Design an enzyme around this catalytic site. Structure first.
Site, PDB file in Angstrom:
ATOM      1  CG  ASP A 117       1.668   2.233   5.827  1.00  0.00           C
ATOM      2  OD1 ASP A 117       1.919   2.845   4.775  1.00  0.00           O
ATOM      3  OD2 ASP A 117       0.739   1.420   5.970  1.00  0.00           O
TER       4      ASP A 117
ATOM      5  N   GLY B 157      -9.382  -0.874   1.588  1.00  0.00           N
ATOM      6  CA  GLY B 157      -9.936   0.378   1.105  1.00  0.00           C
ATOM      7  C   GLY B 157     -10.000   1.449   2.167  1.00  0.00           C
TER       8      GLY B 157
ATOM      9  CG  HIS C 181      -0.147   0.434   2.518  1.00  0.00           C
ATOM     10  ND1 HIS C 181      -1.210  -0.009   1.759  1.00  0.00           N
ATOM     11  CD2 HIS C 181      -0.649   0.718   3.738  1.00  0.00           C
ATOM     12  CE1 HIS C 181      -2.305   0.037   2.504  1.00  0.00           C
ATOM     13  NE2 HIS C 181      -1.990   0.469   3.706  1.00  0.00           N
TER      14      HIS C 181
ATOM     15  CB  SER D 216      -5.061   1.637   3.579  1.00  0.00           C
ATOM     16  OG  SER D 216      -4.990   0.295   4.014  1.00  0.00           O
TER      17      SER D 216
HETATM   18  N1  LIG Z   1      -5.696  -3.684   4.013  1.00  0.00           N
HETATM   19  C1  LIG Z   1      -5.762  -2.527   4.922  1.00  0.00           C
HETATM   20  C2  LIG Z   1      -6.406  -2.945   6.224  1.00  0.00           C
HETATM   21  C3  LIG Z   1      -5.966  -2.396   7.423  1.00  0.00           C
HETATM   22  C4  LIG Z   1      -6.558  -2.781   8.620  1.00  0.00           C
HETATM   23  C5  LIG Z   1      -7.589  -3.712   8.619  1.00  0.00           C
HETATM   24 BR1  LIG Z   1      -8.395  -4.235  10.249  1.00  0.00          BR
HETATM   25  C6  LIG Z   1      -8.030  -4.260   7.419  1.00  0.00           C
HETATM   26  C7  LIG Z   1      -7.437  -3.876   6.222  1.00  0.00           C
END
Ligand SMILES: NCc1ccc(Br)cc1
Length: 246
Positions: A97, A196, A46, A198
């Site tokens: 992902d 951020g 992603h 990810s």
């Molecule tokens: N937007 C990616 C993301 C993944 C896990 C958490 Br918890 C928060 C944000």
């Protein structure tokens, strides 16, 4: 990373910081990743699906700071950007992902291990820790959901693994979580991954070995009650990783 603690790359030397060059030549942070072999960084599809062109990306290893150089860091181009062909995203959940970046420097080299650059072991197939196990997550993502800025200094925290049964309760994520995902959260919901983070690593100790159990993938907000962080379950993707890394 909401809560947790500042760190430096010595405490997560497989962590890869991935950036994108814009037309105009601005460079912005994209996502984290993990060095799984000298030439291969693993991350989340992603992070790249909207800009799939490999030539746009810059990968750093040995970097502890977001917008300044860390002494000893290595900079790489992306020779292959491999996205998972069964990736899908519905409003919340990202499926399959997982992404691979084959890295190569301007001099044509892969990662050179050092005090600040090292690989992380993949898990054995379908071998994950029991629910309740404490694991660590690392990234440059937001420190608060309402922040605009990302932290300049790398962060880490600890989260506990949640069973598929608990996470699939409707008041958590229902059928959005599959057996190819892992949920993890703090018992007080006070620390978590966030925007951020990810692509970065969820690392657990299995049989006394630091292991890439998960890849930061998705969640409903951050550090929210009944909304764990969700991670790609690396131990269910070993055939895909094997088939794409030679
Ligand atoms: N937007 C990616 C993301 C993944 C896990 C958490 Br918890 C928060 C944000």
């Amino acid at each position: 990373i909401i809560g947790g603690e500042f760190t430096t790359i010595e405490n997560q030397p497989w962590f890869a910081a991935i950036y994108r060059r814009h037309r105009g030549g601005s460079v912005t942070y994209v996502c984290g990743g993990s060095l799984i072999s000298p030439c291969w960084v693993i991350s989340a599809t992603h992070c790249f699906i909207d800009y799939p062109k490999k030539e746009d990306y810059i990968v750093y290893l040995g970097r502890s700071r977001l917008n300044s150089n860390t002494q000893g860091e290595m900079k790489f181009e992306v020779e292959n950007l491999i996205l998972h062909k069964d990736y899908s995203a519905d409003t919340l959940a990202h499926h399959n992902d997982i992404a691979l970046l084959k890295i190569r420097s301007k001099e044509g080299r892969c990662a050179q291990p050092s005090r600040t650059i090292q690989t992380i072991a993949l898990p054995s197939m379908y071998n994950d820790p029991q629910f309740g196990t404490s694991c660590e997550i690392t990234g440059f993502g937001k420190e608060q959901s309402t922040d605009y800025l990302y932290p300049e200094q790398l962060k880490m925290t600890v989260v506990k693994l949640i069973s598929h049964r608990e996470c699939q309760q409707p008041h958590y994520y229902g059928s959005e979580v599959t057996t190819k995902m892992l949920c993890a959260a703090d018992p007080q919901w006070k620390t978590d991954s966030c925007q951020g983070d990810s692509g970065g690593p969820l690392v657990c100790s299995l049989q006394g070995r630091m292991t890439l159990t998960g890849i930061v993938s998705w969640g409903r907000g951050c550090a929210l009650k009944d909304k764990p962080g969700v991670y790609t379950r690396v131990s269910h993707f070993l055939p895909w990783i094997r088939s794409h890394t030679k």
